[PDB]
Amino acid sequence: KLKIEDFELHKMLGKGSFGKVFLAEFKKTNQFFAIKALKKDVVLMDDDVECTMVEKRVLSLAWEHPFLTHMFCTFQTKENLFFVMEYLNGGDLMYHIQSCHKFDLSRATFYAAEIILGLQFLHSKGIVYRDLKLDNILLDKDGHIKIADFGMCKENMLGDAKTNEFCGTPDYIAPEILLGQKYNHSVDWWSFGVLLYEMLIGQSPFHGQDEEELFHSIRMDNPFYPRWLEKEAKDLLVKLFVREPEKRLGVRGDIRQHPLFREINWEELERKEIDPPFRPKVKSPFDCSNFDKEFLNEKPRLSFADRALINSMDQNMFRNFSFMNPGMERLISH
Template structure:
């Protein structure tokens, strides 16, 4: 969990409309009324609170937000270590029946909601001092915080967020619920850059026109004309607010913002706003179609999604975390992305298998921003090889890294910034005239493609795998990996616990024999071995990077399977020649001819290597991290279960495309 975690709760959500402060994203404050009361003093919350019904105890963490009615704290369940955002409401603030009813209604409404883009309600309880409402944490804070750092977002980003907002909003409207307070501060962003719609303090059930509530509530800059005119709330009022949100994200300020509240209300009623010239015509047309004075003239949510702004514009599948503070570099999907998506869907289906969320052995890490401290960065030149072979984004897992000095950007953030649509490839440098007996990425690819294609061509259909080797020959494979190529390179740990890094400029450094021996490779055929204690000065900064990646993987990542071997010190470990990331898998090629493919979704793996007698062995590591090694000739003769066959087909497709790239 990032240290900057923020609850999926807006501090202003605790205040009634008449008491809410200035909108988080700027603008004039709402009108104060005679009902406004100064904030009453609240007793200090105990460090540990207990649910008397269940006996569960929760440890109070940092304060996440506060408002007129309540405060929000980070809390940890001492039994499960699960963390929540907990809204704490003092009993003396809900002593009156209408106050208690308001909180009760909010709880009863929110607990019935279950949608990907709605803040998750967990549970609640109360004691003699407080009411505790447990909600999910959203570590990327809210769109208000992103807006504050960025001021304006690009059109692909706006489409990305609006699609998720509309998805959550359609869910609410289909259930007859009006949100009534849509604004940037109520759209929360989780660790994976997924948006959650939250704060249901002003939400209400949809009524008939005659029964609609005439109360003016919400945030001034986002109020619809019919709300100000006391004509009541309908779904169209939420749509109006959505248009104001879109305008704010694209233009840098709310459409009707002025220095005077009365003037703001007048502009809203007259639908009077200025459109910056740098906003695209399709975006202008969509905003205009939403901000219509007559509710019946406004576009519906489905019409918004079918508008040219969405249908003819690129929407990224994911945004990098770096986009919270800086403009990401986004590109429409390449033909290769479509190719791999089509192949993956044909082999594995559209839905990803649900797997248990446990610490993973592989990492395209967000927390690695704290990894490197005091390293001589100038010694490493960046010469990264790119080829268009598919989308680059690997699903990331989360982890906590104990370190101190932050870098400018994290690996996943920088990697995503470079391209949403390109696969990323790192390649070891080689001499212009490599020796004939030195394997290259191309030769490893060619050999693997040949034997796997031949195996699949002769393989009969089967419902289960053939008998696996009871005592397979020991071989080395990648048990953990971490992508830090935005600055340094790609790190990995082998099954004998030696660690290597393929640096961006093509050199390779490995630590073996419990880090006492250093193997350094300038090119495929120029190899050097040093004792760590007598390493040349010019290699020490690279060794430090390898050590830090090794420590990170050791402390944070799980082993990728049950295949282990003793550390070998007599000869250099196999060197990673090339790695390629697509949308579904990571391909790694080694100078001993070994090929390994790791599938992100379920952490299964395919490893192809040669045995000492020259025959090919194929190892499949299941999602349970159990390994099965087969003679490839046996698979060709007896066939295998569909789970393994599908993965072999994908590997062949990947190698074909890689060879042609």
């Protein structure tokens, strides 16, 4: 017995076709959370039932690593699916990059390095992420990265294992996906290269007025590296933008030992003992300063649902959705 009525929803942090994200407090205990609220009819019509389940299962693994969004619990009603998360109020990287256009080399290097620790952890558990992009990297109050939105993940990718779904955000989609090849963790490293390029250069590496032109650019065009770019930043990007997956850095070699990361102790980084070069402005743990005001002004509200589609729905589609860590269990029982 855990319902959304138990949570007081203070503000709406984000919104989309998927659903909404709220800044939520539990039972007036000054204990804050972020709640991604989905509607089951939306999820059904979008064909994201398995994605929702993949999101829940991956987040059950994500507790063990510092640079993934941590999930306290999940639960469902007849209409709704709720992911009760930690509240990460640093702001995402897309938001931050809209303001300054470009990240300085130390700042980009730091983010790149923390993301590597995130991705390699997922790969080691047999999870390929497939939706790496700026707005899926959330910052915490101190400025370290947290990878978010695992609904596009693929599990059981250990050993000699491949998969075949055309997916990802267009700018980031790897050429092996575009070519219809079966793929492994390699895709994430091409996307990583795209993300790193955007951090450093402030524009995308590949371009087009439509997807056909954009996908062609990803298949064929040489990425532009400005004269001002640090030689090792160029080098890493080049070694990531290799179209043959099994020759790509991150699939082969050791990406940790690339000269760009010379000054990084990876044990220290992983232990959060390296102060981030950028620290976001955060007056409090309940601060909202780093979110867009279109969402924050719009008061929190749960949408109605297609009552016909829900009653007609296969009632056990979201079986095994409810998860509950022991920490949240103590908080609730008081």
